[PDB]
Amino acid sequence: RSSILADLFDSQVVDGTTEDANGNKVNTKVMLSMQDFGLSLNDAGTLSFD
């Protein structure tokens, strides 16, 4: 379970000297993930999807 907890939402990063999402102004790094590709987390160390 700890091993899977490492991989659960693998991702890729996006970059640019540009406007990071203005929605309440994130700042860190731009990404798309398995938290975004239809799939998501729920609190039990469990997955959720659409």
Partner: protein
């Protein structure tokens, strides 16, 4: 996704992580704050890492 509200939001997990860790650190099993050094019988910590 980490909008400043999200960045605060995601932080607010950490306080609960912080709170829980403080709770379990100060845990007074059989009266002993189980981890006040070896002197587990009296306050080991505060919330602020003191």
């Amino acid at each position: 996704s980490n909008s400043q509200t999200s960045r605060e939001a995601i932080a607010k997990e950490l306080e609960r992580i912080k709170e829980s860790i403080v709770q379990l650190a100060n845990t007074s099993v059989n009266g002993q704050y189980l981890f006040a050094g070896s002197q587990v019988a009296n306050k080991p910590f505060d919330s602020n890492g003191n």
